[PDB]
Structures are given as structure tokens and as C-alpha cells.
Amino acid sequence: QALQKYSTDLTARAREGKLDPVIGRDNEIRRVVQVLSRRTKNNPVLIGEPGVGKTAIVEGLAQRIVAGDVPESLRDKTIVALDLGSMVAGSKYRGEFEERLKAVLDDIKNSAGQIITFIDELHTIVGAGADAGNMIKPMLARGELRLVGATTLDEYRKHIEKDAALERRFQQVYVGEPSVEDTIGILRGLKDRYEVHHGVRITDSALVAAATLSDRYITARFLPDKAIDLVDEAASRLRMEIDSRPVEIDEVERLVRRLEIEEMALSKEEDEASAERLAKLRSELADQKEKLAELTTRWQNEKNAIEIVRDLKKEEVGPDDIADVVSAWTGIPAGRLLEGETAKLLRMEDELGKRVIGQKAAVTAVSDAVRRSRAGVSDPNRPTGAFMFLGPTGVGKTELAKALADFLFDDERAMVRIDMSEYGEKHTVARLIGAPPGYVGYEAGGQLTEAVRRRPYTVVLFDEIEKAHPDVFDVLLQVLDEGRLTDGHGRTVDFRNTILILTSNLGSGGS
Amino acid sequence: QALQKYSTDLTARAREGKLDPVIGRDNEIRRVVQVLSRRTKNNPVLIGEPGVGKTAIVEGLAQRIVAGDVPESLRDKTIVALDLGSMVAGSKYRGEFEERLKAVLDDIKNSAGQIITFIDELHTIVGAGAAGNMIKPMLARGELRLVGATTLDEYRKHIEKDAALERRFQQVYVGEPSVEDTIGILRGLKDRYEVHHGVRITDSALVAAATLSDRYITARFLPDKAIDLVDEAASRLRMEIDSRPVEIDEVERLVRRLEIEEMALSKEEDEASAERLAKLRSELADQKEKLAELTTRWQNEKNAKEEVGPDDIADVVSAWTGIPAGRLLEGETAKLLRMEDELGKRVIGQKAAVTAVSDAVRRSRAGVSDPNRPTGAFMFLGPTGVGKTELAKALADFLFDDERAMVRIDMSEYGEKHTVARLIGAPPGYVGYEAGGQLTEAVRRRPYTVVLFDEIEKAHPDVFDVLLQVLDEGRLTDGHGRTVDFRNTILILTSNLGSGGSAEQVLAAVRATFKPEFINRLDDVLIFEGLNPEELVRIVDIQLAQLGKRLAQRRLQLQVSLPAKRWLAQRGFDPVYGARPLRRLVQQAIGDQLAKMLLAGQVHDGDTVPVNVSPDADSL
Amino acid sequence: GPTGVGKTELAKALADFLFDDERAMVRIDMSEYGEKHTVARLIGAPPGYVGYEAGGQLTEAVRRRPYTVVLFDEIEKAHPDVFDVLLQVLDEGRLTDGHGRTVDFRNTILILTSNLGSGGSAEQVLAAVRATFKPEFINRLDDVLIFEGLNPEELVRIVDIQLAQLGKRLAQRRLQLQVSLPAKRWLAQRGFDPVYGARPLRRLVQQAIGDQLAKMLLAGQVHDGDTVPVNVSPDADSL
Ligand SMILES: Nc1ncnc2c1ncn2[C@@H]1O[C@H](COP(=O)(O)OP(=O)(O)OP(O)(O)=S)[C@@H](O)[C@H]1O
Ligand SMILES: Nc1ncnc2c1ncn2[C@@H]1O[C@H](COP(=O)(O)OP(=O)(O)OP(O)(O)=S)[C@@H](O)[C@H]1O
Ligand SMILES: Nc1ncnc2c1ncn2[C@@H]1O[C@H](COP(=O)(O)OP(=O)(O)OP(O)(O)=S)[C@@H](O)[C@H]1O
Numbered sequence A: 001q002a003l004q005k006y007s008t009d010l011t012a013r014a015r016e017g018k019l020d021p022v023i024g025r026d027n028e029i030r031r032v033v034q035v036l037s038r039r040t041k042n043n044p045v046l047i048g049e050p051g052v053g054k055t056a057i058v059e060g061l062a063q064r065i066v067a068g069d070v071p072e073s074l075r076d077k078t079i080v081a082l083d084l085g086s087m088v089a090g091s092k093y094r095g096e097f098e099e100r101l102k103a104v105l106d107d108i109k110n111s112a113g114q115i116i117t118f119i120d121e122l123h124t125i126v127g128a129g130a131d132a133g134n135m136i137k138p139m140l141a142r143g144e145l146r147l148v149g150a151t152t153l154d155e156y157r158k159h160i161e162k163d164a165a166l167e168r169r170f171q172q173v174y175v176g177e178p179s180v181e182d183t184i185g186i187l188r189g190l191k192d193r194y195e196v197h198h199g200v201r202i203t204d205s206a207l208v209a210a211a212t213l214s215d216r217y218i219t220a221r222f223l224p225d226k227a228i229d230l231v232d233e234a235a236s237r238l239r240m241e242i243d244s245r246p247v248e249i250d251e252v253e254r255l256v257r258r259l260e261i262e263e264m265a266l267s268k269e270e271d272e273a274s275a276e277r278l279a280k281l282r283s284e285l286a287d288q289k290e291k292l293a294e295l296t297t298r299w300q301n302e303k304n305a306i307e308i309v310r311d312l313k314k315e316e317v318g319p320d321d322i323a324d325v326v327s328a329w330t331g332i333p334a335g336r337l338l339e340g341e342t343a344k345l346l347r348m349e350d351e352l353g354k355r356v357i358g359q360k361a362a363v364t365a366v367s368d369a370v371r372r373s374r375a376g377v378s379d380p381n382r383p384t385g386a387f388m389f390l391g392p393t394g395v396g397k398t399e400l401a402k403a404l405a406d407f408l409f410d411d412e413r414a415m416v417r418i419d420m421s422e423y424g425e426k427h428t429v430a431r432l433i434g435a436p437p438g439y440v441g442y443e444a445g446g447q448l449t450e451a452v453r454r455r456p457y458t459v460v461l462f463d464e465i466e467k468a469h470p471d472v473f474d475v476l477l478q479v480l481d482e483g484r485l486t487d488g489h490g491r492t493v494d495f496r497n498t499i500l501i502l503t504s505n506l507g508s509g510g511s
Numbered sequence B: 001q002a003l004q005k006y007s008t009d010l011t012a013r014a015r016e017g018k019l020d021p022v023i024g025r026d027n028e029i030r031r032v033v034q035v036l037s038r039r040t041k042n043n044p045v046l047i048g049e050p051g052v053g054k055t056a057i058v059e060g061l062a063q064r065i066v067a068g069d070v071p072e073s074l075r076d077k078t079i080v081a082l083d084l085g086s087m088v089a090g091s092k093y094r095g096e097f098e099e100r101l102k103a104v105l106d107d108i109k110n111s112a113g114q115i116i117t118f119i120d121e122l123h124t125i126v127g128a129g130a131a132g133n134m135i136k137p138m139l140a141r142g143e144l145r146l147v148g149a150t151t152l153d154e155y156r157k158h159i160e161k162d163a164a165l166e167r168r169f170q171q172v173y174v175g176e177p178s179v180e181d182t183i184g185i186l187r188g189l190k191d192r193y194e195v196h197h198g199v200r201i202t203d204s205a206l207v208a209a210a211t212l213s214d215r216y217i218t219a220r221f222l223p224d225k226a227i228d229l230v231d232e233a234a235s236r237l238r239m240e241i242d243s244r245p246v247e248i249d250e251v252e253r254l255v256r257r258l259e260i261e262e263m264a265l266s267k268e269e270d271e272a273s274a275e276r277l278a279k280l281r282s283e284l285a286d287q288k289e290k291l292a293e294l295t296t297r298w299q300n301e302k303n304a305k306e307e308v309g310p311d312d313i314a315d316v317v318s319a320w321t322g323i324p325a326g327r328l329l330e331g332e333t334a335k336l337l338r339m340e341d342e343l344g345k346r347v348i349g350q351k352a353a354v355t356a357v358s359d360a361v362r363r364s365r366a367g368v369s370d371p372n373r374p375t376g377a378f379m380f381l382g383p384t385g386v387g388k389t390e391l392a393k394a395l396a397d398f399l400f401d402d403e404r405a406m407v408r409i410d411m412s413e414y415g416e417k418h419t420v421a422r423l424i425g426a427p428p429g430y431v432g433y434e435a436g437g438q439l440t441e442a443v444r445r446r447p448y449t450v451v452l453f454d455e456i457e458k459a460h461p462d463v464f465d466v467l468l469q470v471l472d473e474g475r476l477t478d479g480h481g482r483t484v485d486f487r488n489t490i491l492i493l494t495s496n497l498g499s500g501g502s503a504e505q506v507l508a509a510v511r512a513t514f515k516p517e518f519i520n521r522l523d524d525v526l527i528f529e530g531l532n533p534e535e536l537v538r539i540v541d542i543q544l545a546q547l548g549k550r551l552a553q554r555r556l557q558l559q560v561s562l563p564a565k566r567w568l569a570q571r572g573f574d575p576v577y578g579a580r581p582l583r584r585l586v587q588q589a590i591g592d593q594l595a596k597m598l599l600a601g602q603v604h605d606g607d608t609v610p611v612n613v614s615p616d617a618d619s620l
Numbered sequence C: 001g002p003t004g005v006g007k008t009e010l011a012k013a014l015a016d017f018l019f020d021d022e023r024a025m026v027r028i029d030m031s032e033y034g035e036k037h038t039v040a041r042l043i044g045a046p047p048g049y050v051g052y053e054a055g056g057q058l059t060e061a062v063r064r065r066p067y068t069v070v071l072f073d074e075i076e077k078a079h080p081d082v083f084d085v086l087l088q089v090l091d092e093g094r095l096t097d098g099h100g101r102t103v104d105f106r107n108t109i110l111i112l113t114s115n116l117g118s119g120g121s122a123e124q125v126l127a128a129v130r131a132t133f134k135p136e137f138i139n140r141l142d143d144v145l146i147f148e149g150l151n152p153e154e155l156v157r158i159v160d161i162q163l164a165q166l167g168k169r170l171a172q173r174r175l176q177l178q179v180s181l182p183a184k185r186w187l188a189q190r191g192f193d194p195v196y197g198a199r200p201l202r203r204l205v206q207q208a209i210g211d212q213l214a215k216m217l218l219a220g221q222v223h224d225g226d227t228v229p230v231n232v233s234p235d236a237d238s239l
């Protein structure tokens, strides 16, 4: 009766359909089943990096038990999910939590073995005493409590392996991350639940696109769920739009209201210099009211036509809604050039010519490399542009790197700029990679690394590349042509969406 | 009346035969007896690594007492097993625990010399107060026999800090058994598992599960890391002797799910998903074929296994630790023979290097390779843009069927001496100490990957001295005392020394930049030979296929003509820059042209575009 | 001395018969102690910083079982501070660690190893030895032995040893080889560059016998149990 107080039930939740379906991953289920049924020391532990699916496997095993697909030695067994915080909640006195846990263990052992224990994140059991989480050792080794567990691949090493007399009683089951083709199947089988939670519909191409697109942009997470987030956010945004009026009318209305409020207060300014700013505010206000009227008129035409066709006879998420989600995330633009960017990209060499005069070849070569990437033609695993341009002084080779970095971002200080005139000695490389573990500045990372990692779309400039020691080129050797360097902490950063630019002054006069 | 309240009875538990055989370990039991039969300070302590067997020795002593093989002054002693976890339980008051302990000690002392207290994991006796200290006077008089057993580390971490205590204790070191002793032990315990599971166990399996777990699984000790293989092979054979076997219970589960997916992908009101259903059904039929064939052959075999064999243990050790340890299941022996021409699908030329790589896999798999040495570690070098990294990525692309499964470090960043702590970790007592190594901690888990050292020459010549034992011994220790196992990976070392000689210049640069004791541990030092204008067409078509697959996301296959496919290889061939000028020329010719075409309308998706060679350029 | 001549396999052969297992020695690889602060791992951290409970790496393996032979691979590549620590092991007998205890190396067999110079008979190599170490640390050791190169006569016995090793390894699948004396002397005739020691013999074995055997074995026709002879051709060894 203490199991009721200090444990919830898992099969009693899987029987009422309150668990999500589990798809694939048969080898791991079979290994867990065949480890959970041996004579002694019969308790596995699902180990692996976070996100790959480790509680989903236990819930799939519970659903399989409820269905009856398990072997004879597991028919009609209840899975119990222990909770340790609720056992340490009130234990002030010197002998409360110990007898609590002992009563729980006695209630488990009293049964004929008709109970399968399940502690998730079992790395939290090494303490909990003050000494506890250690009296379980006699029963673990004898095999009287079948203890399925699951911990991260580096909480094990940090908490359990430090008690090598305990991690002997556990059998490890390595759960690797799935591939894109298996993520597609998982999504296919898992979509009709979000389809119900949000009153929308989800196209299958929108499931292929999520899995194939969240594998090359979001490189900091793993991939049974790195796409489910895209699908969920797309569905939620589409539901919001299915509610009151959609986007890009909801922005212009808010903007016009604010401009009106500002103009109604800037009018009563007894000044001479502020009367000039009130002459542009009204202009932009009228310009915005124009666009808002045009949008609200086109909206009625679309809806009107739809209703007409319905009486005569943008309502489901799509592969571009997924793209808009993954573009609001990470800031990287991967869309379809929605009629506002195509014109700008076509008149590109004419807007760089407003700040750089001449250098037609360089301007054309940069504009021709931005479009090969926006049009979806460039190599998907390489920087979108990496070229070194050089010449005599006062020519424009630093201006162009600052003229290109402007109209792409509407700003000027939005590019990561390091000037290699200070890297004269070869030991200064650590200034862009960090210090290896065990030195003074280590909990700071690199300076280029931790600047590209935060926004992986800015352009990077290497001024005066010739002035550096001839051993930093070797460091750059793999940034180019692959877009990847590491740091002290071991985390890889991807330079696969940035435009690298290296200026220099060699020759200086040669034809 | 408190002993039975707060303890149990090992002798009673063994009289009913609730224990296992303890065959072996004569000297340890003899020493335990002769120390227990002392006059004063008669209390031993079994000590050793976790898993070698330290409670089994006490269980054997109990069985031996019950049998009557002990000397005179041990007859009818009734060993008792104390449980301090119950003494401090609900003792929420001011003196309850102290008085419980005192009553138990008095009850033990009142018996003349019968009770032999046995506290397991006695390191937990230091605290428990708020006590556990009212035992030293009872101990330094010979009145308490206190048999105990703690691991080799928790002893010095908890008890050596109490030098008053450890003086009243005898230490009995229990070393681990060897492979022959492990086999002898296994031959006695097989009956218990043969009874628990309705299965028979073979002696060949018993000896394989001891000679194999000593080689592959090296993180635990070896009276018991061999028992698990038997205990899991038995469970798997029981599950198989149950309703359905395996490798049919996979095809069935896969076909069911494929049907469920096809039944719901058919009514998809789309045009882009039309070719995505045109292969699901193909794969489903190709799977039903194999399902039917296996289900038919099953009836043949059932009209025309029953006990665990020697390869079932191999299958268990292969499911564990990742490593393939089985014996050439069919479909593999054809893959390994096709290897040499299957790698040529991505790497053209360099057939010497291809053969030298495949010959280290076909050997280590057949089982003729050296066990205590990596399965191949060779450094190949040559000019630039030739394929040396492409080969290292294409090798690990069909051993694991996943490009990212390779362990890739690039030695361009290990330019200075102190960057060694970056792939090994920091010593005990510094800032980054929990994260461990970077190369170490990536092999200790899943020890079957391929390791790539890119531009080995760019590193400070003190990092080679760390790889000096990775080669020829396959082991390095991180900043934790954890010797990892490199004996079954494939090491690859790329470089660019010389780049301007046939063989003598590069072999002089190698001997001038490396040490002889380093060049000696290596396998064949392969030298690539540069590309020839003839076989560049086989690279042109691979690049074109790659580009096609890349832009196939919108159904834009190109009909590249033969004169264009020839022009793309006529120029763009440099005898100095390899094949990267070709990659650049492809996007200078087709890339920017199609990019201008595409976003200015007139090339809307679903269309096919032909290329044709103009007088100088080529038009779309 | 030179490379591949038997320096390491002697420290592994002494323990092999003093303990009946080549894994009963404390083999630490001194090629990783190339930094000054790396002394903390083979001695232990001070009381209570990050790793006090772990204790030393060298001192602990001998405080618990003080009869082990201790090997130091590539002592030349260490830092000139671990020598100042290992010094007090000699002419004293004991070693104190960061914990604050004292451990006695009075029953161990210290063994060092290096590859200094490798260019002179004894004069250049012993000058190099006297140049990097300290003379007060050298007059405490026993004989500073120099190992000799291999000769074609001392190589046929090594071929016999390697063939015995290969045969013992092929006992799992129950195979055994028949090596004709022409092949047994050809394998020693080739692979005698007197600059790389005995290593090239291992590679020649795997290239000649092992590769052919492993290509035949999984192509059927050499199924387990039976024996196989090896004979000589103009150049190669046909099986
Ligand atoms: N095989 C699978 N079939 C269906 N859904 C799956 C599968 N694997 C994972 N998922 C889903 O993907 C998500 C993964 O979440 P969890 O598995 O709960 O995270 P986790 O594996 O427990 O990792 P941590 O360490 O606990 S955060 C959940 O939404 C699961 O429902
Ligand atoms: N073609 C050009 N069009 C417009 N401004 C230019 C042009 N060339 C140079 N300038 C001006 O020159 C100034 C600095 O030129 P930079 O391009 O920064 O010099 P640079 O090209 O980097 O040469 P070095 O070798 O680095 S000093 C700015 O004020 C630019 O506006
Ligand atoms: N001499 C032996 N004969 C037969 N079985 C043995 C022998 N020694 C150990 N075993 C078995 O091997 C396993 C070892 O378990 P234990 O000895 O209880 O572990 P341990 O030595 O107590 O180590 P810890 O620190 O308590 S986890 C058990 O299944 C024993 O039954």
C-alpha cells in the first residue's frame, strides 16, 4: 500500500491510451525484454544522448505488455514508475526515509515478481540519503527487483560509474539516434495526435520536409524530436492564423496604430527642428495605410472566391510553413524568395554600386554566389562563399566586405570581424579556439567560435591575412571546404551558412 | 530475541540449499578459517575489486560449516548476517538506535562463542548515528568475530580514515581468477541455469563464453562477466523456443508497419508525393518475397535449435559492445568479396590503397589478425586533391551505413604542446576534469568506430608520442586511470609531405619529419599517384549525379549531352590541383546560369533542362 | 638502444614468469607526462580539491600489493620534474604522495626504457644519456644496459616463435600450418633491413601467409579442421 503513495502506474496509463504510440526500435525492445527475464542481475539501463528516445522505449514496452506481444515470462505484469522526491519529501527525523524505502522494497519483494520497477534518471539515486540508494544492492544482485532505468550518456559517467560496486549490477543498452528515413516513419505514425490537438491538417510532404530540413540547420540537437518541434510550431501558428486575421496584416495594423499614436503627439511640438521629422512620419504613415488597404482588399478577393467555389460545389501546414519555422529559428533564411526578395537579388550589383565604384568583377562574383545559395543550387555542406580578393591600397577591398555585409542585414556591426594583424606569433591561435581543459581561461570558449555559434548567418572578415604567422592558415585549412572547427569544450561549430572573406595586399603594383 | 529481529541466518539459509556452488577458492577459505580461529582480534575482512567474488566465499564457508569440513573450533557456529539498514529505521527518538545496537551486541556477547557476525559492505558502519562507534572495545577483546567484505576503494575511502578501527581488522586480498579457473567455475553453475530455463547448455559454449568475454568486454572482472553471456543466451533461446523465432519476427513487424504507412499515404491529395509512394510498395513487395521464402524454409527445417551453441555467445557479445564477433553470417561473405569494387563507386583509381584497406578488413573479420593490436593503422599521403580524405570517409560509409559515424579530429589545431590535455583530459585537481578526454571518451563508448587524423604533419612533434602506444599496443589512459581499448578500430593518418616527388622525395620528408620508432609501428605507408586525364570522366559523371540528386528536390533532372560531358573534363584538369578545379568549373558553368534562370521564372519546377555545348561555353 | 630489438618484451617476459601473467605489472606510459603539472596523477591530488578520493595512480597500485614490477616506457619523453620525484625512490626506498602518507618501493623491480640517440655504439648514446638525466640519478641505478641489433642467424628462431604464435592463434577454429623449411628460411631471408628491428617480420608474415589465408578461408574450400601446407614459388608463397 506504500507503492500507491510513492509510485504511479504505467500500464494502468497505457491501457487508457494516455501514452503516445511507439514506432520501430525493435532490437532495443527485444534486448530489454531478454535482459529483463534472466535469472540473476536482471535489470537493464537505457543509455544514450538526450532526445534519441529512452522513455518512449519503456512506454512502448508497456503498450506491448498491455497488448500481449511479450513472451510467456512477462504476461500480465505491472510496470511501476517510482518517484524518489515524494519519498524524501517529509523525512526530517533520523529514521523516516530509510524505513520508507525499506517498506517500499518489502512491498516489491512480497509479490511473486509480478512488478517491474522503473526509475527514470536513476543517476539521482546515488545520494538521496543525507547513504541511501545503497541498501538496494543486496536485492539488485540477487535479482528480485527488475529495475529498468534510463539516463543520459554523460550522467552515467559522472554519477554512477563513480560507484563501480553499483554499476556492476546494471546491464547497459546503448540507444543510438535514428536516421532521417526512420524519423520520417516515426513522424508519419505520430502526426494524427497533433492533427487532433490543433484543429488543422498536416500534409505528408510537410513531414518529409521537416525531417530532411532539421538535419542540416539545427546541428545542436538529435533527431527523433528535432523535427517534431517544427511540426508542432507550424501547426500552432497555423491554428493562430485560422483564428483571427492572419499575419502580414496583423503586423501592418499594429505598425499603423503606433505611427498614428506617435504622430498625434508629435504635432503639438512648439519647435523648428521637429517640424522636419513630422514631414516624414506622415509620409510613411500614408505609405503604410496604402499597403494595408491593398492587403485587406486582396484578402476579401481570396476568401470571396473560396466561398463562391464552395457554394458552386492556407488551411493545412506545408513544406514552406516548416521552412518559415526553421527560419525564425536560427535566423537562417531558407524559404522560396516570396516575391519581395527576388527583385532585390536581381538588382543586386546596382545596390552595391551605391557604395563601391568599379570592381565589377568582384561585385559580380559576390552577387553570383549569394544567388547560387538562395536559389538552392550550391553544395549543401560547404560555406556559401569563400574567396580571397586582393590588390593595391585605397582600392575598395575592405569597403566591399562592409558594403556586402550591410544590405544583407540592414546593419553594419552585425558581422564578425577579426583583423589578423595581431596574430603575428603562432601561439595567438588560442585566441580564436580557446584554451584546452586545465588552464586559466577555459570557461570562456573561443571568440570566433562563440560568435558564429550564436548567429550562424553573419559574414566573417579576415583583414590583412598576410600579416599573420604562417601557421594560422593551417587552422583555417578546415574552416574552408568543410565549415567546421572545434574548441576546448569539444563542441563543433559549423561555418556552412557564412561568407568568408580574406583581404590582403600582396604584389601591390604587379600587373 | 533481537538477533532474529534485526538480522537473518546464513547457516539456516544454506541448510535448505538456497545458495549456489562455490567450487574453487581453497586458500581464501582456509585463511578465513585460520584467522577466525584466533584468540584476540579474530575478525577478517575480504577485500578486492567489485565482482571477483567476496560474498560467495562466505557462502562457501557457510556451506562448508553445514557439511562439517571445518576444524574443531568451528562446529555448529550459525553464522549471522547483520542488517544495519533496519536498525536505523523508524528510530526517530533520542536513543532508540543506540539501545537497539547495544541490545544486539549484548545478545551476541551472551552466547559463549557461537555467533559469527557477518556485516556485508561494512564501510557503511562508520556513520548511521545522526554511533556505529560503540564497537571498538567489543572488538579489541576477541569477543566479536565480524566477518566483512568491502570493495578495494571504499575501504580506503571510509575506514582508513579511522586508523583506530583498521587496527582491529585482518585483510584478506581476493584476486581475480583466470580463464581456466573461470571455465572450471562455469562447469559447475550450468545446471542451475539449465534448470531455470528449459534449455541445455554446451561445454563448447561454456568455454567460448570465457575465452571471448576476456578479449572483448574489458571493463569488468572475470568470474562473472562470463556468466552474463550464458544467462542471456539462455533467455534468448527460451524466447526463440517460444512462439516465434527471430529474423522472421523482424520481417513481419516491418511488413505490418509498411502496410500501415502505405494504406494512409495512398489517399494523399498531392503530386509531389506521387513518387514517394512508388517505392514504398516496391520495398513492401521485396520484403514480402523474403518473408514468404523464410516462412517456407522454416516448414522445411521443422519437418526434416534446442541448446545454446558457441555462436550464440558470439551473437550476445555482438549485441553488446557493438563489435561484430559472430562467424560470417551469410550475406556478409559476399559483401566482403565485393568490397573492392563497391568502394570504387566513390573513389576512382588508387586501387593499391583500396586493396590495402580491404585486406585489413577481410583478414580481421576472418579471424587471422593479431588480437592485441588495432585492426589496421596505416598512413597514406600524396599530392593534393587526390582522394585521401574521400577514401577515409567512404570506408566508414558502408561499414556503418552512416557518414557521421566516423570519429574525426583534425590536427591543424593541435599545433602547440599543451593541446594534448585536449584529447586526454586534465589531471585530478584542475578546472576541466569531469568532461574527460575528447578522443578517449568517444571510443570508450561504442569501441568500433573509425578514427581519422587529418593533416598529421601540422601537429607539434609531441602529439605523435601520444599515438606511440595507440599503435602497436592499442591503449591510452585518460586523466582518470581508465585504460581504453583501441585493439579493434581502424586508424587513418593523412598528410601532404613532399607533394613534388615520385617516391624518394616523399620518403625522405617522412623520415626527416617523423621518428623511426614511429614509422615502424605503422602498416603500409601508401602513396597516391595523382589523377590522369582519362579517368576524369568517371569523376565528371559522379559530380553530375551528385548535383542531380542535390537539385532533385523539385524534379529538375538535367539531360547532360555527351559533348558537354566531354568538354567539362577536357578543361578543368590541372596536374597540380587535383580535382577541385572541376568542382569549381561545374558551378561556374551550370551553377550560376541555372541560378539566374530559376528565380527569373521560365524554369519553374517539374521541368527538365538540357545542356548543350556552345562554341566556347555551354548553354542551357 | 635501437628500435624493435626487445627492450619492452623483456620487462614483459620477466613478469610473465615471476607472476604467470604478463598483466601483473604496473605499466605506465611516460609519453603522456609532457607537462609540469602532470605529476599530480601518478602521485594523487592534495586533500580535497577535485579528485582527492581517487588517490594516486602509481603509489596506490604498490601500496596495496607491494611486489609488482614497475615499467616506465619512454622515460626520455617525460618532463624534468617527474625525475626529481622518482629520485627519492632510490637510496631511500619510500615515496610520499599528495595524500600525506608514505609508500615503500623496497620489494619492487624498477625498469626504465628509452630510445636516446640510436646512432652510436656506446659513446654517443651514453653521452646523450649523461646529457639529459642527472649524474646523481644515474649512479644510483644498476647497469645501464645497451641492446644490440639483430643478425640473420638470430632471426630464424624469431620466425619460429612468430609461426608458433600464429599456430596457437589458429587453434580456435582448429587449423594448423605445415611450414616447409624453404619457406621458413625465405621468411627470414627477406625482411632484414637492420634499421627497423624485428617489426617488418610481423608485417611480412601477415602480407604473405595471413592475407592469402584469410582470402581463402571465407571463400569456402578451406573450411575448419583440416591442415594447410605452405611452400615457395619463384617469389611468393603458394598454399
Ligand atoms: N520510436 C519512437 N516512436 C515514436 N515516438 C518516438 C520514438 N522515439 C522517440 N519518440 C518521441 O520523441 C520524443 C523523445 O522524447 P523522450 O524519449 O521522452 O526523451 P528522452 O529519450 O527520455 O531523453 P531524456 O534524456 O529523457 S530528455 C517524444 O515525443 C517521443 O514520443
Ligand atoms: N571604389 C571605391 N568606391 C568608393 N569608395 C572607395 C573606393 N575605393 C576606396 N574607397 C574609399 O576608401 C576608403 C578606405 O578604403 P579601403 O577599401 O578601406 O582601403 P583598402 O581597400 O582596405 O586598402 P588597404 O590595403 O586595406 S589600406 C573609404 O573611405 C572608401 O569609401
Ligand atoms: N568461486 C566461485 N564459485 C562459483 N560462483 C562464484 C564464485 N565466485 C563468485 N561466484 C559468482 O559470481 C558472482 C559474483 O557475485 P559476488 O561475489 O556476490 O560479487 P562481490 O564479489 O560481492 O562484489 P561486490 O563488491 O559485493 S558487487 C555471483 O553470481 C557468484 O555466485
Ligand SMILES: Nc1ncnc2c1ncn2[C@@H]1O[C@H](COP(=O)(O)OP(=O)(O)OP(O)(O)=S)[C@@H](O)[C@H]1O
Pocket: B346, B347, B348, B349, B383, B384, B385, B386, B387, B388, B389, B390, B391, B495, B496, B539, B578, B579, B580, B583
Ligand atoms: N579519386 C577520386 N574519386 C572521386 N572523387 C574524388 C577523387 N579525388 C578527388 N575527388 C573529389 O575531389 C575533392 C577532393 O577532396 P579530398 O580528397 O577530401 O581532398 P584531399 O584528397 O584530402 O587532399 P588534401 O591534401 O586533403 S587538400 C572531393 O570533392 C572529392 O569528392
Ligand SMILES: Nc1ncnc2c1ncn2[C@@H]1O[C@H](COP(=O)(O)OP(=O)(O)OP(O)(O)=S)[C@@H](O)[C@H]1O
Pocket: B517, C002, C003, C004, C005, C006, C007, C008, C009, C010, C115, C158, C197, C198, C199
Ligand atoms: N630479442 C627478441 N626476441 C623476440 N622477439 C623480439 C625481440 N626483439 C624484438 N622482438 C619483437 O619485436 C616486437 C617489438 O619489440 P619491442 O622489444 O617491444 O620493441 P622495443 O624494444 O620497445 O623498441 P621500441 O623503439 O620502443 S618500438 C615484439 O612483438 C617482439 O616479438
